[PDB]
Amino acid sequence: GSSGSSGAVSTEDLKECLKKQLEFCFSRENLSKDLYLISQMDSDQFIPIWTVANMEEIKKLTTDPDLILEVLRSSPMVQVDEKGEKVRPSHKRCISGPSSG
């Protein structure tokens, strides 16, 4: 098989991991599993960027707000306000399946 799972360590692997964290953290199962995340959410089902940017995993993976904001706004699962103050999990399916980008 394979010794482990991941290989070398480059910016590509770091960026990919960060994307999975935000996507997974905003996931339906993760959202309902993270009682804290839900408690932090807003009235309009919006989560503060500070909370995510303060995350240990997110901090160890990235320490830049611009980079993190881009990842969130770059990914569909989540959407960052044009301004960049609050982000919410895209509660609407845009793609069908085999179609993406």
Side-chain angles (χ1 to χ4, degrees):
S2 52
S3 174
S5 202
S6 287
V9 178
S10 197
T11 67
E12 298 286 283
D13 272 23
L14 282 161
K15 158 173 284 80
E16 272 278 71
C17 204
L18 160 56
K19 179 173 160 283
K20 294 190 180 284
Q21 297 280 29
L22 293 172
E23 280 174 337
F24 203 85
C25 275
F26 277 64
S27 207
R28 280 207 86 156
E29 273 282 58
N30 206 100
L31 281 172
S32 173
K33 159 279 210 209
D34 200 336
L35 294 176
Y36 167 80
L37 197 57
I38 309 170
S39 210
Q40 291 316 300
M41 279 171 146
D42 210 11
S43 183
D44 280 289
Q45 300 287 37
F46 270 96
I47 302 160
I49 304 162
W50 90 253
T51 284
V52 178
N54 271 235
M55 281 187 123
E56 288 204 36
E57 284 170 290
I58 308 307
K59 270 169 69 83
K60 78 168 176 154
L61 291 168
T62 307
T63 48
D64 208 299
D66 292 63
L67 193 59
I68 301 161
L69 283 162
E70 183 156 58
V71 179
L72 280 164
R73 197 190 286 163
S74 283
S75 204
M77 305 198 77
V78 300
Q79 205 160 41
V80 185
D81 203 77
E82 298 168 280
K83 284 202 195 72
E85 281 159 316
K86 282 270 162 155
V87 55
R88 73 153 207 196
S90 69
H91 82 304
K92 284 194 285 174
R93 285 179 282 171
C94 57
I95 60 161
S96 274
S99 272
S100 66

